[PDB]
C-alpha cells in the first residue's frame, strides 16, 4: 500500500464527496435565481459528474456566484483527481522500469 496508491484512493473517495456535496450545494445556491436550471438534486448530480470531467452540455451551467464557486471547486477536485491517478500510474511504471534494468 504505497503512497501514490493511497493518495489516489483518497482522491477518488474525496471526489465522490465533493460531487455529492457539490450537487447539494448547487441546488441551494441556484434556487432563487430566475431561469436557473440546476434546481433539482438528481440533475445537479449529473451536472457535477460532467463538470468534474470538464464537460459542459449546452446551457447546463450555474448562474449564481456561489453556484459558480461550487463549479470551480468541483472542476479543481475533478482535475486534481484525474491528475493524481496519472501521477500514481507514472510512479508505478517508472518503478518497474527500474526493476527492468536491474537498477
Amino acid at each position, epitope marked *: 500500500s504505497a503512497l501514490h496508491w493511497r493518495a489516489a484512493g483518497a482522491a477518488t473517495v474525496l471526489l465522490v464527496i465533493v460531487l455529492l456535496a457539490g450537487s*447539494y450545494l448547487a441546488v*441551494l445556491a441556484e*434556487r*432563487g435565481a*430566475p431561469g*436557473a436550471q440546476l*434546481i433539482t*438534486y438528481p440533475r445537479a448530480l449529473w451536472w457535477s459528474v460532467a463538470t468534474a470531467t470538464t464537460v459542459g452540455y449546452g446551457d447546463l451551467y450555474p448562474v449564481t456566484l456561489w453556484g459558480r464557486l461550487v463549479a470551480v471547486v468541483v472542476m479543481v477536485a475533478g482535475i486534481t483527481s484525474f491528475g493524481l491517478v496519472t501521477a500514481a500510474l507514472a510512479t508505478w511504471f517508472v518503478g518497474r522500469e527500474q526493476e527492468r534494468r536491474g537498477h
Partner: antibody
Amino acid sequence: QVQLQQPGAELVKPGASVKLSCKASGYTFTSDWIHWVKQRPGHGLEWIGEIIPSYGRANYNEKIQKKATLTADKSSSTAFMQLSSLTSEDSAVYYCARERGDGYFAVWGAGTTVTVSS
Amino acid sequence: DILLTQSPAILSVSPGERVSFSCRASQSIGTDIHWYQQRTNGSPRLLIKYASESISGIPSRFSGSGSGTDFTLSINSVESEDIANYYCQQSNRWPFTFGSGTKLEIKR
C-alpha cells in the same frame, strides 16, 4: 398517515398580519423543501415560496408582491409563513407541500382558509 | 419564468371513453412536468411525475404522454370519481409554475 398538518382557518383584519403553521411527520430529510401555494376562490394554484428547514434559506415569488416571509423551527419540524399588510386580495386557501427537491410536490397539506375582513 | 397553457379550459366527455388534457409550455422543458388532480374542497393530489412516470396508489387508467412543449394527460374509461380540476406543473427552471387548469365534466 397524514404527513402535513395545517390549521383549518385563520381570520385576519384588513392591514393586520398573520403567521401560518405547517408541521410534518413521516420521512423528514435534511434535503426536504417546504413550499406554499395560494388558491383564490374559483382560481388556479399560485406558487408563493419555498424553504429548506435545515438551513433556513427561503425563496419567494417575485412576480407577485412579497407579502410573505418564511421561517422554520427545526426541533418541531414545523414551517411558518409570515404574511403582513393583507387586503381582500389575500383572502385565499393556503397550502403547504413537501418537495423532496426533485420538482414535484408529493404530499400536500389540508389548507388554511384565510379570510380578510373586519 | 415558464408559462404553462392548458387548453381547453372545460372538457366534457362521455362515460367510459378516453380523454386527453393538453398542457403547453412557453419553451422546451424536456420531461420536467407533473400532473395534479384536485376535486371540490379537496387538496391537490399528484397523478403523474416526470411526464409519464406513474405514482403508486394512482389508478392504471391514468397515463402521461409528451416531451418538449406538448404534454398530455390521458384517462381510459372515465368514471364519476375523475370529475375534478387538473393541473400541470413544471420544474425545469426556477421558479416553479402551474397551469391555469382544466376541469373535467362527464355527460351522462
